[PDB]
């Protein structure tokens, strides 16, 4: 199933390339830089695709329970809404057993995307129900 365009990137070297940022961490720096490589090169800077894919995967995970590792990522009716490269990298994470590091992968890919687009994010928590006046003040 995996395309040769993806297999060339996987079997080749990508970590030594120039990126928007040098990324601290263990294996998940490569899980994120490889996503950035796909999104920059073959998908032509369609970053938000994978950021939506993370959301889709979360929604699938919640409905399927925690043991989604055992099922294969490519052949599945639930995963059909994901991208082939995203599936490839989830297969690679399954091979390396680092499936417990997924949040530490998305938290890095979002930083890579936000520094490529140069969109620093900010998080607010207001209320049990929003109030427009307090928001305008804030």
């Amino acid at each position: 199933v995996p395309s040769p365009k993806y297999i060339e990137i996987y079997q080749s070297d990508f970590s030594r390339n120039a990126y928007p940022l040098e990324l601290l961490g263990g294996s998940h720096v490569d899980f994120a830089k490889l996503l950035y490589s796909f999104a920059d090169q073959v998908e032509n800077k369609k970053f938000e695709v994978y950021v939506e894919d993370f959301k889709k995967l979360d929604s699938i995970i919640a409905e399927k329970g925690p043991f989604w590792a055992e099922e294969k990522i490519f052949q599945s009716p639930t995963f059909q809404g994901l991208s082939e490269g995203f599936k490839f990298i989830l297969g690679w994470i399954q091979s390396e057993g680092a499936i417990d590091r997924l949040e530490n992968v998305r938290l890095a890919y979002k930083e890579l995307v936000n520094e490529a687009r140069k969109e620093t994010t900010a998080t607010v928590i207001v209320a049990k129900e929003p109030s427009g006046n307090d928001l305008a003040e804030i």
Binding site: E22, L24, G26, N104, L107
Partner: protein, 109 residues
């Protein structure tokens, strides 16, 4: 006015010590400085930096409210060394090394 600076979330805790996982990459912590851990909305757990690692993780010595620590708690940074109150007003007292007085029966150094 006073916005606390955060550096990461609590990754692991082994008894008296802990390991932090930094949130962002461009954030940088000093060495031997005090950190804070929002164990609750009310209380704060002081700490200290003893190691730094190639992964960006931080080896931390904890000093207060160790039992209230969890995984995922917000981790803050003072960016200053550890200090304590000092002066003649402290003579005649038993005192926690954190400066807290131990009951019985301005300046910083």
């Amino acid at each position: 006015l006073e916005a606390k600076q955060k550096i990461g979330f609590v990754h692991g805790i082994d008894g008296t010590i802990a390991t932090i996982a930094p949130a962002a990459s461009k954030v940088t912590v000093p060495y031997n400085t005090v950190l804070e851990i929002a164990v609750s909305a009310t209380n704060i757990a002081n700490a200290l930096v003893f190691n730094l690692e190639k992964d960006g993780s931080i080896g931390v010595i904890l000093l207060d409210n160790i039992s209230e620590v969890r995984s995922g708690q917000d981790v803050y940074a003072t960016g200053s060394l550890l200090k304590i109150p000092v002066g003649f007003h402290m003579l005649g007292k038993i005192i926690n090394p954190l400066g807290k007085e131990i009951p019985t029966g301005t300046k910083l150094g």
